[PDB]
Design an enzyme around this catalytic site. Sequence first.
Site, PDB file in Angstrom:
ATOM      1  N   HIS A  87      23.505  -5.668  -9.003  1.00 26.68           N
ATOM      2  CA  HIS A  87      23.590  -5.920  -7.619  1.00 26.68           C
ATOM      3  C   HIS A  87      22.523  -5.215  -6.747  1.00 26.68           C
ATOM      4  CE1 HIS A  87      27.570  -7.881  -7.841  1.00 26.68           C
ATOM      5  NE2 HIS A  87      27.924  -6.694  -8.743  1.00 26.68           N
ATOM      6  N   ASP A  90      20.170  -5.936   0.625  1.00 27.84           N
ATOM      7  CA  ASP A  90      18.916  -6.273   1.630  1.00 27.84           C
ATOM      8  C   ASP A  90      19.604  -6.259   2.907  1.00 27.84           C
ATOM      9  OD1 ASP A  90      17.154  -8.071   3.390  1.00 27.84           O
ATOM     10  OD2 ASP A  90      17.430  -9.817   2.002  1.00 27.84           O
ATOM     11  N   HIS A  92      18.584  -7.090   6.758  1.00 29.34           N
ATOM     12  CA  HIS A  92      17.591  -7.657   7.862  1.00 29.34           C
ATOM     13  C   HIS A  92      17.055  -6.875   8.798  1.00 29.34           C
ATOM     14  CE1 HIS A  92      19.289 -12.157   6.913  1.00 29.34           C
ATOM     15  NE2 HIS A  92      18.892 -11.432   5.833  1.00 29.34           N
ATOM     16  N   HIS A 127      23.081  -8.249   2.809  1.00 26.16           N
ATOM     17  CA  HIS A 127      23.731  -8.821   1.740  1.00 26.16           C
ATOM     18  C   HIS A 127      22.939  -8.575   0.520  1.00 26.16           C
ATOM     19  CE1 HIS A 127      20.503 -11.711   1.372  1.00 26.16           C
ATOM     20  NE2 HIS A 127      20.387 -11.725   2.763  1.00 26.16           N
ATOM     21  N   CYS A 128      23.734  -8.666  -0.643  1.00 32.89           N
ATOM     22  CA  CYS A 128      23.042  -8.899  -2.012  1.00 32.89           C
ATOM     23  C   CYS A 128      22.219  -9.947  -2.142  1.00 32.89           C
ATOM     24  CB  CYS A 128      24.119  -8.748  -2.881  1.00 32.89           C
ATOM     25  SG  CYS A 128      23.973  -8.470  -4.565  1.00 32.89           S
ATOM     26  N   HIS A 138      25.724 -14.485  -5.230  1.00 34.05           N
ATOM     27  CA  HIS A 138      26.523 -13.358  -4.666  1.00 34.05           C
ATOM     28  C   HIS A 138      26.835 -13.251  -3.175  1.00 34.05           C
ATOM     29  CE1 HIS A 138      25.422 -10.532  -8.191  1.00 34.05           C
ATOM     30  NE2 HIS A 138      25.310 -11.694  -8.619  1.00 34.05           N
ATOM     31  N   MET A 143      29.254 -11.035  -0.726  1.00 33.36           N
ATOM     32  CA  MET A 143      28.605  -9.879  -0.728  1.00 33.36           C
ATOM     33  C   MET A 143      27.542  -9.929   0.681  1.00 33.36           C
ATOM     34  SD  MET A 143      27.854  -8.495  -4.657  1.00 33.36           S
ATOM     35  CE  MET A 143      27.570  -6.944  -3.896  1.00 33.36           C
ATOM     36  N   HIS A 248      33.772 -19.779  19.368  1.00 31.49           N
ATOM     37  CA  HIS A 248      34.460 -20.300  20.831  1.00 31.49           C
ATOM     38  C   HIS A 248      35.749 -19.377  20.835  1.00 31.49           C
ATOM     39  CE1 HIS A 248      35.576 -22.730  24.045  1.00 31.49           C
ATOM     40  NE2 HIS A 248      36.930 -22.810  23.450  1.00 31.49           N
ATOM     41  N   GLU A 272      30.515 -21.434  26.817  1.00 35.96           N
ATOM     42  CA  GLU A 272      31.860 -21.713  26.380  1.00 35.96           C
ATOM     43  C   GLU A 272      31.720 -21.315  24.789  1.00 35.96           C
ATOM     44  OE1 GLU A 272      32.409 -26.212  26.859  1.00 35.96           O
ATOM     45  OE2 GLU A 272      30.148 -26.379  27.294  1.00 35.96           O
ATOM     46  N   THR A 273      30.796 -21.807  24.053  1.00 41.70           N
ATOM     47  CA  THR A 273      30.474 -21.824  22.687  1.00 41.70           C
ATOM     48  C   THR A 273      29.168 -21.530  22.349  1.00 41.70           C
ATOM     49  OG1 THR A 273      32.143 -23.704  22.391  1.00 41.70           O
ATOM     50  CG2 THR A 273      30.680 -23.409  20.573  1.00 41.70           C
ATOM     51  N   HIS A 299      33.826 -23.638  16.428  1.00 40.46           N
ATOM     52  CA  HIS A 299      34.402 -25.152  16.981  1.00 40.46           C
ATOM     53  C   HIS A 299      33.829 -26.213  16.378  1.00 40.46           C
ATOM     54  CE1 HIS A 299      35.844 -27.689  20.288  1.00 40.46           C
ATOM     55  NE2 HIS A 299      36.386 -26.531  20.729  1.00 40.46           N
TER      56      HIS A 299
END
Lengths: 334, 334, 334
Positions: A87, A90, A92, A127-128, A138, A143, A248, A272-273, A299
């Site tokens: 494993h 990473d 971002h 994340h992996c 993964h 993950m 939402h 709203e969303t 939504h």
Amino acid sequence: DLKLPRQKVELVAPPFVHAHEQATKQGPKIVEFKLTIEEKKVVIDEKGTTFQAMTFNGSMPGPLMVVHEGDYVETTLVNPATNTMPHNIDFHSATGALGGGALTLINPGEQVVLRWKATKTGVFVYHCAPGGPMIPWHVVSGMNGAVMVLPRDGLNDGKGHALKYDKVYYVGEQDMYVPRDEKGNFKSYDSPGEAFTDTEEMMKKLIPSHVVFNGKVGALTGKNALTANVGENVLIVHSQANRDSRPHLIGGHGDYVWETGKFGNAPEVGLETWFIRGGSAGAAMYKFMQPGIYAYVTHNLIEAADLGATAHFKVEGKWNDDLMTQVKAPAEIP
Amino acid sequence: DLKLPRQKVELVAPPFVHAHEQATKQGPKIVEFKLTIEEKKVVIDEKGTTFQAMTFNGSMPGPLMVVHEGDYVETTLVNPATNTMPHNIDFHSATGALGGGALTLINPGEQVVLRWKATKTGVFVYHCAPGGPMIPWHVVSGMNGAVMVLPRDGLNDGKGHALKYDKVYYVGEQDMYVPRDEKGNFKSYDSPGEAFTDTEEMMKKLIPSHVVFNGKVGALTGKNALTANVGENVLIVHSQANRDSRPHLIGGHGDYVWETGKFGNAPEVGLETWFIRGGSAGAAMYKFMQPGIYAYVTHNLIEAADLGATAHFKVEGKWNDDLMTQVKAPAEIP
Amino acid sequence: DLKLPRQKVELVAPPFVHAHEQATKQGPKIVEFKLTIEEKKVVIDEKGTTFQAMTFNGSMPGPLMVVHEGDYVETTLVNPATNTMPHNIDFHSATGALGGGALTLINPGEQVVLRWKATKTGVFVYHCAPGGPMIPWHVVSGMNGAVMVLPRDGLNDGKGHALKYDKVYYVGEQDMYVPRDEKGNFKSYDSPGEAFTDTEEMMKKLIPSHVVFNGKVGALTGKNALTANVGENVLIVHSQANRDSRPHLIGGHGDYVWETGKFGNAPEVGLETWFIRGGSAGAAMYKFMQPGIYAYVTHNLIEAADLGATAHFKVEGKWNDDLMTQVKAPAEIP
Ligand SMILES: OC[C@H]1O[C@@](CO)(O[C@H]2O[C@H](CO)[C@@H](O)[C@H](O)[C@H]2O)[C@@H](O)[C@@H]1O
Ligand SMILES: OC[C@H]1O[C@@](CO)(O[C@H]2O[C@H](CO)[C@@H](O)[C@H](O)[C@H]2O)[C@@H](O)[C@@H]1O
Ligand SMILES: OC[C@H]1O[C@@](CO)(O[C@H]2O[C@H](CO)[C@@H](O)[C@H](O)[C@H]2O)[C@@H](O)[C@@H]1O
Ligand SMILES: [Cu+2]
Ligand SMILES: [Cu+2]
Ligand SMILES: [Cu+2]
Ligand SMILES: [Cu+2]
Ligand SMILES: [Cu+2]
Ligand SMILES: [Cu+2]
């Protein structure tokens, strides 16, 4: 020779977030975190469907890590010998080496320590990503998590006014791909390895069997409902590591929303969303005006109601009849 | 009676872009371009899968055309007699006649000349649109590209500061629909015509078999990796003529991003992942801070890793240990 | 004891919108609306496919309701005894009780009156939401519409300049899920109840059979084409209650676009294609510069051309050769 002060953080399971300051007078520190990978078979729905999960710290999503702009984030990743696969991690939020991926590949029995500087503000996915076809597998196995990098002066509305939240929750949405047998029933597997062939065939068709918050259908409902009171400003951080979501708050709004999740940009108002792009996190703040039950959903209502993606908030306080009122209750048509 | 100066452009195959000025002291010109339609059977993956492609200028995507606001774009479209179908061109940058579509329908053996004024700045899709059910089919067969209309003063950050790029690449993402036989193998066809029935049945189910950059799995990897150096500001133009994409530079960021692709709007800053709406182009600029391999992907990771949608950048320069460092290499757990 | 003046509105069927003021000198009023639920079997395509629709006021979408910020919206919802199911209404524009849902559940033979204050400006979805698995089913059966809450001073461009529209149209996009029999033909049902089992199995696979504007393939084409003249500023309100859409005016642009649909945010300028998040409404304004046919589509072109999602505008006026011209008509290649 980086000699800044060190601060350890005790991570807490989602949807809760470890205690942190918003605006701070501290300067840069080395903030220390530890993540331990666990592979485990879990139950993801009310009918007892099982799933071969791989997690950071035993939860889906992984815990939210909170730091401030300019801090150095030092992560110990541990892959115990009880796991069967290599494993990595990473971020971002980080710059270089595939987000740290290229520096953190560990076999069962190993650990590694990565440090990266938090130069960009916002909420970011981690994340992996252990190479090739394994990367999607993964990630959709659970993950992934998120990190929040705050400005030192806290959040603002882009017009010079501070936005201070009274609490923050982290909702991680997970698309899951559970194959079915000939009968039409979901299949169970003895290991992640054995799940792989059938799971990959299904993934490539791009339609999830389940879409869940915090790892399971109904995870954030009942006793584990999110809570607030009328007058409280709540920040909801939402991540989706692989597939789009459209959060939402039923009965409310996003008063201030960073849909791309980056605090260098002013927030949008009165949504709203909103839309969380696959491979990102976003954040929305709302001040509750009314008591009662709210549902927080993606939504796509089929996903929300039928595939698992609904949370609840229970809000206490006084009903405001100016905002909304039942003028006449259900009665027979005259 | 339009008597402005004329300038010919020699188009170049993607991901490269023909030489142009960013900020310019030229006034409006008639910029002349030629596109020649080619229908051809191509190999789209490493296992030798074939595909009945239809292209502008022999490439998927079609070449990027670059002009400035207020120029007149004069395009010669040629449909040689070696092709079997009528074709046309629609520019999202243009105003009237269905983007030029209604004025450019040509049978094999014919050519046409359209001129349109570039009144709106940004990156825009162009694609074939020869009426009815043919429109989606021609587009997903590869007949799409993009045009970039620059402000005369070059790009800016919305706060009065110039943004100058040192190089630009054009990444065109193509969703492809290749049917499978009973055995489960991809089918091959002798003509686009013959591919049509099976291809249309699959298209209507909305799930692509492949999602590729620059026409093929692995097209922008290995010897054809994108390149940069630490300190270089690179503009990546990304188009998707039919389906959403979520670009992500693994190990980097979008320092300045126009996700809707229109330079009348200020860019967003510090993105992890951005969103290209189906039927649009966007653009993202990043200044490389670290050497090594980066992957540029759509962050549906199943699409990226399993369906074809990954490019590489190879970046030269000096590693910055302040930004990121392996504090302790993989070692046995104590 | 709310004693403001009362104003009744006569709702009109989409894509038309009931007469309203943009900027107004009126203060807050109680605006009164009535919606009557109708369940009915309808024809949704040119081949005669039928569909068990459930509607507000007999149309898909439901009618657009227009009010100003600070008004009180008082809705009478009526569920006649000729219907077979309970229904309710949720307004995304409203605050509390699940958008009114929790206060408006009515059996056949009943009616209810809800009042809510319009505190947030923009275009918002309203839809039925009668609990659990019924929520997606009622919505994708056609029970959704939109409301527009205008600022009292009308729309603005975010730079102090008024944006006044000469007409407004409401385009409601509906994803429909019609199952097929063994033969491959679409199935017909005697009641919504009977359609439910097969329809729900299909919904959970997330791929619609049809995607339509105003309730039917070709609804806004031919005699029912949208219209304008060169020089007219037209506002197009677009809603999608369950699934993303990517509106595009072929031959035009979005001069001013609120893609998230909320007028507290400045509009984006000069878009080719915009994005309506599932569970939201957006609005785009364009001033026509050229006569002729335009198509308004979702720019998933498979959906547009093959699943039903294309409208037409017929625009009158004088062709502008400066903007676009056929320099040379189709001729044989020299
Ligand atoms: O009853 C045998 C018959 O059923 C099929 C499925 O239609 O296969 C089932 O039985 C096979 C032999 O027992 C299994 O291998 C298979 O997994 C199961 O689907 C047919 O293939 C077979 O002729
Ligand atoms: O072996 C014949 C048997 O196979 C099926 C598929 O299960 O059809 C195959 O053979 C047909 C006759 O040779 C072909 O026309 C067809 O293309 C192929 O799938 C059955 O339909 C048939 O009974
Ligand atoms: O011809 C009978 C044979 O056809 C199948 C489908 O392959 O079922 C059809 O006929 C059944 C009995 O008449 C129907 O119940 C069913 O709805 C229809 O598909 C087989 O199951 C059956 O052996
Ligand atoms: Cu892993
Ligand atoms: Cu990632
Ligand atoms: Cu063509
Ligand atoms: Cu187009
Ligand atoms: Cu209903
Ligand atoms: Cu809703």
